[PDB]
Amino acid sequence: EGEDLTLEEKAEICSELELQQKYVDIASNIIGDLSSLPIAGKIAGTIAAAAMTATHVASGRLDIEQTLLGCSDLPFDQIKEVLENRFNEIDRKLDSHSAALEEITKLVEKSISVVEKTRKQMNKRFDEVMKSIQDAKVSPIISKINNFARYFDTEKERIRGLKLNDYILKLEEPNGILLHFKESRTPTDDSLQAPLFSIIEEGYAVPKSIDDELAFKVLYALLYGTQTYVSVMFFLLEQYSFLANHYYEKGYLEKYDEYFNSLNNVFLDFKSSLVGTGTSNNEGLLDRVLQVLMTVKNSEFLGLEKNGVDEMLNEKINLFNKIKEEIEGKQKMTLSETPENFAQISFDKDITTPIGDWRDGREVRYAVQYASETLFSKISHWSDPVSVREKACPTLRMPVDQTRRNVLVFRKFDSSKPQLVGEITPYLSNFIDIDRDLYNAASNPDSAVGFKEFTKLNYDGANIRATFDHGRTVFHAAAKSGNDKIMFGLTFLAKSTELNQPDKKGYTPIHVAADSGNAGIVNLLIQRGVSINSKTYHFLQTPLHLAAQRGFVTTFQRLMESPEININERDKDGFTPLHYAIRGGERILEAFLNQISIDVNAKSNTGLTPFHLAIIKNDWPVASTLLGSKKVDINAVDENNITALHYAAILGYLETTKQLINLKEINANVVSSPGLLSALHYAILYKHDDVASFLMRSSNVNVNLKALGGITPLHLAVIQGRKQILSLMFDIGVNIEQKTDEKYTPLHLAAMSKYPELIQILLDQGSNFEAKTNSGATPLHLATFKGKSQAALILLNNEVNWRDTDENGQMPIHGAAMTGLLDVAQAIISIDATVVDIEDKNSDTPLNLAAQNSHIDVIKYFIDQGADINTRNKKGLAPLLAFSKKGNLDMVKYLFDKNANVYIADNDGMNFFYYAVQNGHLNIVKYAMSEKDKFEWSNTDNNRRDECPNEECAISHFAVCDAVQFDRIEIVKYFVGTLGNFAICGPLHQAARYGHLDIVKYLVEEEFLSVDGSKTDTPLCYASENGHFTVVQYLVSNGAKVNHDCGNGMTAIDKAITKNHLQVVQFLAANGVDFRRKNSRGTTPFLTAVAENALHIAEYLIREKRQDININEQNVDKDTALHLAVYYKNLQMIKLLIKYGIDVTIRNAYDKTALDIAIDAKFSNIVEYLKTKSG
């Protein structure tokens, strides 16, 4: 068979928990295909998205082998947790919106992507590097580096999936991960910077020895440490930027300032650590490792000559240069400039101060900042406290900005949270703080006080068109607070453009009014006639969506007097307000169903209906309300034909399944699109025994439904080890002998399942244990093929026959050879000893079959019995011969001590020496020295007599040229050094024919073998036959004989002509080989090319060399190049010779001119061309 196979390895691969996460990983790849997971997870919880992913993966054809090996089963909570992590990551990377984080994230991702990918690729290589270090002097350095890397990536994995609040709490904690990352240490006193500097200081990475393997490992560890240090730098940078912008958007100025300072400090320190402050003292480590790599690259004797070493060091140099250029490109991260605060403050407006935050006994502080849209600015230090007595609104005099930038102003009262109060232009001085007070007045929970404050501030010239909180205006503030009088006054004497102005997130005043459930102002807004079908910029919701989500009934009732309202407005994922009303509850579902124009059976992009979401949510009252509505399609399906009852079955909800079954119009026989799977199939597939048992006892449920591949619920129960399901189905009376399309019996699946204990229960019921598989196999016959030895013993004790025939001639005795189940063989031979040497259709024996699978523990057992040692197959494989290819030197000595035949030849003709030579195993040829007594070096083989050119020939000398055949340097050098009889096969000449540059490179210098050779054949003569470019160029330089021609007048230049080697002719013409020297036959090589009728040669050969070779040469035939083109019917070259100016007036002895050749031989087409040219 094939030595490389993963079918046996698929047992642990499928059952591997890491590959179970790969099943999660492909499930994690589903969120890329379908984007409806998040919003749906907002409606019915995270229980919906994982269910959709599971149904999508399980909707297709069920594979027998994959389901059998066990990784068709996966706990649902494991998928749910990964969806939690992904949703949390997406939400974290979405709430923080700012151009500053946009630029910082773009920079960090384009900086890290490649180094992160290569570090992930080389993680396992470094892991195997860890165990390869044995020296005590260097071991601590690699230990520290590995410990730091493990801490770093474990911490990243732990921190990646947490929620935003948990993210903030974990990042903001005493002795946290960031604190350990700043100075690059760990709680278990592990650091890498000091070892990284120490290893460079002494330089153990230099390859002092010819190999110096430990030096290469140390250099690899140094590279790993450098990449990890860059990665932790960028992780710290991005985390600090995220924290800073989060706390700036929240409104905490002090914490944003401290994170700003920390980010600047860490950036400066890491930059000084990598590139150095002018690299005067080589503080930076990037240039140090760069110079170390340059030195080791320039070193030649120290190098190991390996081709991959050059490529990997080139990649490292390129990557380090790119990252160094990226780091040195920027000289600052944030804007550290500080503005100038107010120069004078007064209280000019006559406003008594029981208003707003202005109270007697309070103090006020002010601060200024540069308004930057691309970088992070810094807030000025807070000014001196100003007491508040009898005056509320102050006036600030601002000096003209030097840089002429707009300045943001912040105000703080006592220890309260700072608030942004406005913006000041470079050319305006008198700034009045009265605009934000109106905004706060409109947000007052009290109505009378808020209205009075609003009127008082508006009477003194307060701007009502100022945005304060991400685009929110006074209209939004009145909408959120619900002030009826303020909203009425704002709507009156106003313009429609203010009432429909969205904020930075797309929320309009009607959106805010509906979100907060303020129906009294929604009525006024509708009466004024504002736009209602507006949508949020990102998530695309209307006020109806928000009202349904929050469950406000009066808001909806006041929203339904709008003539323009549209109930069936959709969203980004196509969900309707009725879909959102499931979270609202019965009080809002009844309000929706009361409306005439409700579309109860609306479908989303995936095809989900409100009934589907209600069933998935496991909330029965909403489903009962929907059933109370008379327009519900119970059997509605989705894009994959998944019914709500299928969802209930696959999520294992017993109560909802019972309630759905009791429905009169329910249909339990609906199936999927590509799988034809019913809900019962899903129940047994996910091993929810209670719901499956309830379904199988239902009258309207068919347990005999059939799907793709001939799959019935009985087969699933048998293969997945559901004992209670099997017992219940036995009680019901399900047919036992049901067969699939490929007709696997249930007993076969029981014998192939991971729970063998089932099969005996089947034996209780009675099954055709002698039934043949579609491939002519019995349960005992095919059991050993998979390799479950433990399940085979219990079947053998039932007195099952040990003699059988199939199309392949295999039996359990044969099947044990491939897997090496010695425990099965511990009883087979004991019962019957007449099986050790037998034959089948393909002429194989267990000795042969076990040999090619390399089972040492089983192969040695058969020699004790006395099996045939020289058995053969149609391919000629033998137990001794197959092991030569593998090269397992450990046990080959066990076979030679059983006085076997000296060699065995296949149909092609070979012995165990050659496959060692063919595959280049140096161990085997060394061992042959100890059997010079057993094996004769001068033995001659007659099987391959025809191959050797003359008489009969020895086996030994072909091994030299066969080593040359696959350019095995190790084998050929042993023959030259240790044997003086290596020149009989002529390695130099054969290597040139087969074009092995390495062999001819090695043999020339130290051996000083003659280039010409001791025979008429020369390496150049044979090299030109096969047209190999590399061999010719090296053999030219040292000097060689090229002018003299080989036998039968077949020279080197003509050899490339016949085979049409364009590249070979290019170089051979540079040497200026004499083309005038005629061959043995008498035809010049220039004329010989036309004899072969080479059309392509005239393009290049003629133009370059013309002075040495005249165009009027003749052969013994005495016909020019035009005559040959006449005979071969090729007009392309006929028109080329005349253009080049050849002579055609010379006549041979045939006394027939060129025109007469085309006339006497009846070539009418070419007569015209020659006549016109001739005068």
Side-chain angles (χ1 to χ4, degrees), residues 923-990:
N923 296 115
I924 297 169
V925 56
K926 295 291 184 181
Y927 190 104
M929 183 278 288
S930 77
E931 289 62 43
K932 297 293 183 182
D933 189 18
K934 298 298 293 295
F935 155 79
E936 190 171 12
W937 191 247
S938 85
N939 191 17
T940 285
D941 184 73
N942 296 115
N943 189 359
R944 185 179 67 189
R945 175 191 172 183
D946 61 357
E947 190 66 30
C948 187
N950 63 6
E951 189 65 26
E952 70 269 13
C953 306
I955 297 169
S956 302
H957 66 279
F958 302 132
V960 177
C961 291
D962 292 341
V964 170
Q965 184 63 255
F966 289 167
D967 55 86
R968 288 292 179 177
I969 188 168
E970 314 292 338
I971 310 183
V972 71
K973 67 182 291 294
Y974 171 91
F975 287 153
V976 173
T978 64
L979 295 186
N981 63 7
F982 84 97
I984 294 90
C985 204
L988 175 58
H989 287 61
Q990 308 313 309

Side-chain angles (χ1 to χ4, degrees), residues 92 574 578 611 662 827 846 1021 1032:
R92 185 177 65 246
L578 189 79
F611 207 80
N662 290 318
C1021 185
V1032 184

Side-chain angles (χ1 to χ4, degrees), residues 209-230:
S209 306
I210 191 66
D211 167 47
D212 218 331
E213 189 273 332
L214 73 164
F216 280 71
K217 293 275 182 167
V218 175
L219 167 65
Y220 191 110
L222 168 76
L223 294 174
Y224 197 38
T226 45
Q227 313 213 41
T228 59
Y229 182 76
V230 182

Side-chain angles (χ1 to χ4, degrees), residues 205-424:
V206 63
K208 315 171 185 62
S209 306
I210 191 66
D211 167 47
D212 218 331
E213 189 273 332
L214 73 164
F216 280 71
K217 293 275 182 167
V218 175
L219 167 65
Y220 191 110
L222 168 76
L223 294 174
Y224 197 38
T226 45
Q227 313 213 41
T228 59
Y229 182 76
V230 182
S231 296
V232 65
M233 183 177 176
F234 279 100
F235 174 73
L236 278 154
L237 284 174
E238 59 156 330
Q239 291 312 313
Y240 274 127
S241 66
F242 164 70
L243 294 174
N245 182 225
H246 174 59
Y247 271 118
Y248 182 75
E249 294 293 328
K250 277 185 61 156
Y252 297 177
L253 295 199
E254 277 50 50
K255 292 177 71 68
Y256 157 70
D257 291 331
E258 66 183 1
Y259 290 129
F260 177 95
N261 299 342
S262 66
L263 168 68
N264 271 338
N265 295 336
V266 65
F267 172 59
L268 284 184
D269 305 353
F270 271 81
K271 189 176 186 184
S272 179
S273 195
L274 305 156
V275 305
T277 313
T279 191
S280 71
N281 203 26
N282 290 318
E283 175 70 58
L285 60 85
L286 266 184
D287 73 330
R288 298 293 298 274
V289 298
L290 281 178
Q291 92 176 42
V292 169
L293 294 173
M294 293 299 291
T295 304
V296 66
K297 182 175 174 66
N298 290 349
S299 296
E300 182 63 33
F301 165 77
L302 316 186
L304 263 170
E305 191 274 331
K306 186 178 198 53
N307 296 115
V309 170
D310 207 348
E311 195 192 35
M312 65 184 73
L313 281 71
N314 288 134
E315 291 165 30
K316 296 319 172 189
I317 297 298
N318 170 257
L319 183 63
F320 276 144
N321 275 0
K322 182 67 181 294
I323 201 70
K324 185 177 180 180
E325 289 166 354
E326 288 170 14
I327 297 169
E328 266 292 335
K330 291 174 70 175
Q331 61 86 29
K332 74 179 187 194
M333 185 84 51
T334 69
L335 173 69
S336 303
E337 298 298 318
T338 299
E340 313 299 312
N341 218 305
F342 68 97
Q344 188 274 151
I345 186 165
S346 177
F347 287 91
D348 315 324
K349 292 183 183 293
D350 189 358
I351 299 157
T352 300
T353 184
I355 185 163
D357 291 331
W358 302 97
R359 292 189 296 272
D360 291 331
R362 308 202 74 188
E363 65 183 1
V364 64
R365 289 180 171 94
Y366 283 96
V368 297
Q369 201 186 21
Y370 285 162
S372 174
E373 273 79 11
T374 61
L375 294 174
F376 278 132
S377 309
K378 149 173 281 171
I379 295 97
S380 294
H381 45 268
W382 294 91
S383 77
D384 76 304
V386 183
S387 66
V388 179
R389 285 87 170 94
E390 293 179 353
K391 281 309 178 63
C393 290
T395 315
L396 283 75
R397 176 171 302 131
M398 296 279 327
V400 171
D401 195 54
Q402 183 178 2
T403 300
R404 277 71 173 175
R405 292 179 181 176
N406 275 39
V407 176
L408 295 173
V409 188
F410 295 96
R411 169 185 75 187
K412 176 195 307 182
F413 279 96
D414 308 333
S415 187
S416 296
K417 193 193 60 178
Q419 281 179 327
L420 188 152
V421 285
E423 183 178 1
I424 193 66

Side-chain angles (χ1 to χ4, degrees), residues 409-584:
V409 188
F410 295 96
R411 169 185 75 187
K412 176 195 307 182
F413 279 96
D414 308 333
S415 187
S416 296
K417 193 193 60 178
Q419 281 179 327
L420 188 152
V421 285
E423 183 178 1
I424 193 66
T425 48
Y427 276 115
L428 188 153
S429 66
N430 293 348
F431 169 80
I432 297 169
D433 209 6
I434 203 164
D435 285 346
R436 180 66 181 270
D437 299 298
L438 200 70
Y439 184 79
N440 290 349
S443 296
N444 196 34
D446 196 4
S447 287
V449 175
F451 177 74
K452 284 191 186 184
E453 294 181 326
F454 193 94
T455 300
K456 269 186 198 310
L457 295 174
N458 216 49
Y459 179 79
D460 278 278
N463 197 13
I464 71 178
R465 296 171 177 86
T467 61
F468 284 109
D469 190 359
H470 299 120
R472 304 272 199 110
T473 82
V474 76
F475 293 88
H476 301 60
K480 183 175 174 66
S481 66
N483 217 312
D484 285 351
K485 293 198 204 70
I486 287 179
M487 185 64 72
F488 174 66
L490 279 182
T491 50
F492 186 74
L493 73 163
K495 277 74 69 177
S496 66
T497 187
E498 305 155 336
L499 301 175
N500 294 262
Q501 182 190 330
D503 63 358
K504 201 158 288 162
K505 275 188 156 192
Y507 285 76
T508 65
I510 195 79
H511 282 65
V512 175
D515 189 358
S516 66
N518 273 118
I521 61 171
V522 174
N523 183 37
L524 294 174
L525 286 189
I526 282 183
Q527 268 192 319
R528 181 66 178 171
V530 296
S531 178
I532 298 169
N533 298 118
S534 296
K535 290 196 186 188
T536 293
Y537 281 169
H538 182 244
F539 280 138
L540 311 173
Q541 293 82 17
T542 53
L544 275 192
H545 282 70
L546 308 171
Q549 197 186 7
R550 277 222 207 281
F552 300 137
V553 176
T554 311
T555 300
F556 182 76
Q557 293 179 356
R558 293 282 99 89
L559 269 183
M560 294 299 291
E561 293 83 3
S562 159
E564 182 65 26
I565 193 66
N566 181 214
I567 301 299
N568 280 302
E569 270 285 347
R570 291 185 154 53
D571 79 18
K572 181 174 71 68
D573 287 334
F575 292 97
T576 61
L578 189 79
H579 288 69
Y580 277 36
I582 297 169
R583 184 177 179 179

